[PDB]
Amino acid sequence: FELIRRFFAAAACAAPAADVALGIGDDCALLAPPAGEQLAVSTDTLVEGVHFPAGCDPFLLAQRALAVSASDLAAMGAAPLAFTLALTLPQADAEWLQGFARGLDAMARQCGLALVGGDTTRGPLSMTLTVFGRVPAGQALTRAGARPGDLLCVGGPLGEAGAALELVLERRSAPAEVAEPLLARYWTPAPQFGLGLALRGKASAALDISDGLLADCGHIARASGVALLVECQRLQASAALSGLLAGEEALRQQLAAGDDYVLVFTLPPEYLGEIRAAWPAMAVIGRVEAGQGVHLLDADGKEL
Amino acid sequence: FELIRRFFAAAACAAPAADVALGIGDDCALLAPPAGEQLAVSTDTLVEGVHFPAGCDPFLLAQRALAVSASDLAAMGAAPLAFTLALTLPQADAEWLQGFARGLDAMARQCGLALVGGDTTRGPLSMTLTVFGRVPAGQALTRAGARPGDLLCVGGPLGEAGAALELVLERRSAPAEVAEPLLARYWTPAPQFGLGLALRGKASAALDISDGLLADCGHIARASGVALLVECQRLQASAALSGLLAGEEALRQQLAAGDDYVLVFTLPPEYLGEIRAAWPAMAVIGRVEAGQGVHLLDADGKEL
Ligand SMILES: Nc1ncnc2c1ncn2[C@@H]1O[C@H](COP(=O)(O)OP(=O)(O)NP(=O)(O)O)[C@@H](O)[C@H]1O
Ligand SMILES: Nc1ncnc2c1ncn2[C@@H]1O[C@H](COP(=O)(O)OP(=O)(O)NP(=O)(O)O)[C@@H](O)[C@H]1O
Ligand SMILES: Cc1ncc(C[n+]2csc(CCOP(=O)(O)O)c2C)c(N)n1
Ligand SMILES: Cc1ncc(C[n+]2csc(CCOP(=O)(O)O)c2C)c(N)n1
Ligand SMILES: [Ca+2]
Ligand SMILES: [Ca+2]
Ligand SMILES: [Ca+2]
Ligand SMILES: [Ca+2]
Ligand SMILES: [Ca+2]
Ligand SMILES: [Ca+2]
Ligand SMILES: [Ca+2]
Ligand SMILES: [Ca+2]
Ligand SMILES: [Ca+2]
Ligand SMILES: [Ca+2]
Ligand SMILES: [Ca+2]
Ligand SMILES: [Ca+2]
Ligand SMILES: [Ca+2]
Ligand SMILES: [Ca+2]
Ligand SMILES: [Ca+2]
Ligand SMILES: [Ca+2]
């Protein structure tokens, strides 16, 4: 118990914060959600050996856990507010917990997220973070509004965290300056809060890419009752990705690595200029048509 | 994925509900918290082999997980609103998930809790539930307000879930009619929502008993800067507990079993009649004095 007060109640991100009436210390936290906005709520579990490697640095792990969880707020166009941390520990290592809380502080500061509570238990290493944000009624980015003619877009480079995973698992090697930007996408992805806000009233549908580009395109296609067409030639590897992989290897990571935590969204053509101006890292990758399913097209428009 | 729609999106407790603008289906749920009240937020993890036995009936397990999590809302005097379910599964067994969702529905209905979202992952069996409730500002039951002279009270019989655990783990046996009420306290404890509401403006401090009576009395003693005195002679075993255990065995379970999910609270003497009238199952177990720590006293007032 005492390590909770020492490491988390005392953490910088657990300090008093706006819209938080009561933080760590009681049976519940108390939020005063801003009047006139809805509260966006999402929860994510990271499991040792599944979402991160055993033996990893806890300073990095805490940032990854909070970032991948906070990304679902950006996927709704919500502004960040607070979170809770449920932590399951095989043993209560003070030095591990110290590094974990240090990394949690760093990512929470960068995300504007107040730590208001949590839970600590014993067992195989796992953590579940529940994040809270605010969005005006009727302005949240949902998945069901895509229409034929909409552009299919992403908020940034794809495949970088999958390339990074090869390095993390020591299944591939790279020069240090190639590894560093890719490892940053795995351990410290940046939730695309600013893009989510910019897409309010403009994107017809949106979510974040967690499972993988093609898989997660499926949610828009199914919820909206349309076909999504991904154009292979529009999947250009970033400089960072290209430092490690080429051709088909890079393409496969873009299509199916997941862990990107960039938004995939459909956009009426009339808003392309506004979103390009507000978020130059966005890219058009395809289009929406009438029909069903997700379709990958080659340079000639033939299905793969 | 499809089992989520089949078993949880289709669950009765996931139906449209008041103050829920968006339930299951997107990257976040959207809550419309009632204006003029704070949102109580708590999260709990249950780990296989720690908080429930391997191989157990999922219909019972789902009720236990939600009830023990919802109890923290009662511990703040909050009225129930909604919850999310993060579930980690070693394998996706359709019959297990069906029973789990059936039990989740039953307990969620009895608790008035809408299922609005969650997360599903692979790994050693675990679940983290995050519960949401509402409480007027300034009326939540906190831990720091106890004063010397306050009565120390609990909301119901103690030790019953610890007695039950002996049966659950097959470390003890009992006639069926003795086992049934105790097993009900382990698998389906009733969060004391009505008591939490009745204690608004009356209890000086409160929390629920999860770790154990003496351990959890420590939180009030430390937060309030007082001594809590538990009177052994006031720890009378219930009929249900007495069906299985006697004397010291029953007392030890009352003091240290935990898993009671009844409230422990301090109460100004002038409110005893009101709380007895509203919640006849409550019991006075001791008193608050100036000083520090938790103290167990015998019939003669000597410390044990
Ligand atoms: N890993 C964690 N990170 C942040 N806050 C935490 C963490 N674990 C616990 N907390 C918070 O720190 C306090 C722990 O005190 P405790 O009395 O154990 O809370 P609780 O919610 O009543 N525990 P329980 O009902 O037994 O699950 C609570 O306010 C928790 O919300
Ligand atoms: N065990 C569960 N119980 C209840 N709802 C769940 C559960 N698992 C997932 N959900 C919800 O069902 C939907 C699952 O769709 P999905 O697109 O996978 O959501 P998500 O939150 O974007 N997934 P991810 O970002 O990869 O963690 C979401 O609305 C979840 O909140
Ligand atoms: C050590 C390690 N770290 C990361 C990964 C990548 N990874 C795990 S799960 C998942 C999909 C989303 O999770 P879920 O399916 O639970 O929704 C992805 C892209 C890995 N394979 N190994
Ligand atoms: C199979 C099984 N089911 C239940 C129990 C009882 N139990 C586990 S943890 C705990 C304290 C609160 O949890 P925590 O310490 O994680 O806060 C209690 C009372 C058990 N020992 N075994
Ligand atoms: Ca809690
Ligand atoms: Ca509690
Ligand atoms: Ca997830
Ligand atoms: Ca997520
Ligand atoms: Ca360098
Ligand atoms: Ca969305
Ligand atoms: Ca998944
Ligand atoms: Ca998906
Ligand atoms: Ca989510
Ligand atoms: Ca998502
Ligand atoms: Ca707990
Ligand atoms: Ca709890
Ligand atoms: Ca019977
Ligand atoms: Ca309380
Ligand atoms: Ca505990
Ligand atoms: Ca405790």
Side-chain angles (χ1 to χ4, degrees):
Chain A
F1 174 85
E2 322 159 6
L3 296 185
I4 289 159
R5 183 71 39 179
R6 177 172 160 195
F7 295 130
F8 294 111
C13 59
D19 302 335
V20 177
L22 177 64
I24 291 166
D26 223 302
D27 299 274
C28 298
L30 298 174
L31 303 176
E37 285 191 72
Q38 295 169 340
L39 196 72
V41 180
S42 178
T43 191
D44 273 296
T45 304
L46 291 82
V47 178
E48 186 180 64
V50 181
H51 306 94
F52 60 93
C56 68
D57 180 359
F59 177 81
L60 298 181
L61 171 58
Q63 303 195 64
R64 178 171 163 75
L66 182 57
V68 308
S69 301
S71 173
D72 264 338
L73 298 177
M76 298 303 296
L81 177 47
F83 73 109
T84 61
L85 167 70
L87 187 59
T88 300
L89 305 170
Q91 43 200 11
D93 178 353
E95 181 181 348
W96 189 98
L97 286 167
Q98 177 184 284
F100 192 95
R102 267 178 53 245
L104 198 72
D105 265 337
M107 183 54 72
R109 173 176 192 96
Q110 298 179 70
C111 291
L113 286 167
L115 172 65
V116 300
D119 205 43
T120 304
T121 51
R122 178 180 54 86
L125 182 58
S126 174
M127 54 210 68
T128 295
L129 287 78
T130 307
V131 293
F132 312 96
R134 45 195 271 268
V135 61
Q139 291 186 34
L141 315 176
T142 60
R143 299 165 174 199
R147 308 89 44 87
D150 285 350
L151 303 176
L152 181 61
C153 311
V154 299
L158 305 176
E160 291 177 335
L165 178 63
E166 300 238 273
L167 305 176
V168 173
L169 297 181
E170 297 186 322
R171 288 174 25 89
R172 179 177 299 268
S173 60
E177 303 308 308
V178 168
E180 282 165 13
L182 299 171
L183 292 171
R185 297 280 298 121
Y186 181 86
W187 292 113
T188 55
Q192 302 203 309
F193 297 123
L195 181 57
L197 299 177
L199 292 178
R200 289 177 179 181
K202 290 186 169 63
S204 53
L207 70 158
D208 59 351
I209 301 173
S210 52
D211 295 286
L213 171 72
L214 298 182
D216 289 327
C217 282
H219 298 301
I220 291 173
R222 291 191 290 274
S224 294
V226 294
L228 264 60
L229 284 51
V230 176
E231 289 166 47
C232 251
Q233 287 300 298
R234 293 185 187 273
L235 297 178
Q236 180 161 356
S238 66
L241 179 56
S242 285
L244 188 72
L245 301 173
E248 188 198 8
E249 289 184 326
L251 175 59
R252 181 173 309 264
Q253 297 283 357
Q254 293 185 80
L255 296 171
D259 267 351
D260 299 285
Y261 305 104
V262 311
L263 304 188
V264 54
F265 58 101
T266 53
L267 190 72
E270 69 207 279
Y271 292 133
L272 174 58
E274 289 79 4
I275 303 308
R276 274 207 196 286
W279 199 264
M282 67 136 283
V284 177
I285 63 159
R287 64 192 182 274
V288 183
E289 306 278 4
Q292 60 186 307
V294 172
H295 308 267
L296 183 65
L297 307 180
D298 66 11
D300 302 318
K302 298 281 169 285
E303 280 213 53
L304 305 166
Chain B
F1 174 85
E2 322 159 6
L3 296 185
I4 289 159
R5 183 71 39 179
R6 177 172 160 195
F7 295 130
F8 294 111
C13 59
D19 302 335
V20 177
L22 177 64
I24 291 166
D26 223 302
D27 299 274
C28 298
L30 298 174
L31 303 176
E37 285 191 72
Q38 295 169 340
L39 196 72
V41 180
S42 178
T43 191
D44 273 296
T45 304
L46 291 82
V47 178
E48 186 180 64
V50 181
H51 306 94
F52 60 93
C56 68
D57 180 359
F59 177 81
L60 298 181
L61 171 58
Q63 303 195 64
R64 178 171 163 75
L66 182 57
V68 308
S69 301
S71 173
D72 264 338
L73 298 177
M76 298 303 296
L81 177 47
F83 73 109
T84 61
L85 167 70
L87 187 59
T88 300
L89 305 170
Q91 43 200 11
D93 178 353
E95 181 181 348
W96 189 98
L97 286 167
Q98 177 184 284
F100 192 95
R102 267 178 53 245
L104 198 72
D105 265 337
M107 183 54 72
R109 173 176 192 96
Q110 298 179 70
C111 291
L113 286 167
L115 172 65
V116 300
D119 205 43
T120 304
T121 51
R122 178 180 54 86
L125 182 58
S126 174
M127 54 210 68
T128 295
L129 287 78
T130 307
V131 293
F132 312 96
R134 45 195 271 268
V135 61
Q139 291 186 34
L141 315 176
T142 60
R143 299 165 174 199
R147 308 89 44 87
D150 285 350
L151 303 176
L152 181 61
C153 311
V154 299
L158 305 176
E160 291 177 335
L165 178 63
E166 300 239 273
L167 305 176
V168 173
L169 297 181
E170 297 186 322
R171 288 174 25 89
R172 179 177 299 268
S173 60
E177 303 308 308
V178 168
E180 282 165 13
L182 299 171
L183 292 171
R185 297 280 298 121
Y186 181 86
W187 292 113
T188 55
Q192 302 203 309
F193 297 123
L195 181 57
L197 299 177
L199 292 178
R200 289 177 179 181
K202 290 186 169 63
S204 53
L207 70 158
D208 59 351
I209 301 173
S210 52
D211 295 286
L213 171 72
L214 298 182
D216 289 327
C217 282
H219 298 301
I220 291 173
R222 291 191 290 274
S224 294
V226 294
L228 264 60
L229 284 51
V230 176
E231 289 166 47
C232 251
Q233 287 300 298
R234 293 185 187 273
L235 297 178
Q236 180 161 356
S238 66
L241 179 56
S242 285
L244 188 72
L245 301 173
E248 188 197 8
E249 289 184 326
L251 175 59
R252 181 173 309 264
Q253 297 283 357
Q254 293 185 80
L255 296 171
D259 267 351
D260 299 285
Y261 305 104
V262 311
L263 304 188
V264 54
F265 58 101
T266 53
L267 190 72
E270 69 207 279
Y271 292 133
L272 174 58
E274 289 79 4
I275 303 308
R276 274 207 196 286
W279 199 264
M282 67 136 283
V284 177
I285 63 159
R287 64 192 182 274
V288 183
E289 306 278 4
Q292 60 186 307
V294 172
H295 308 267
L296 183 65
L297 307 180
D298 66 11
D300 302 318
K302 298 281 169 285
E303 280 213 53
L304 304 166

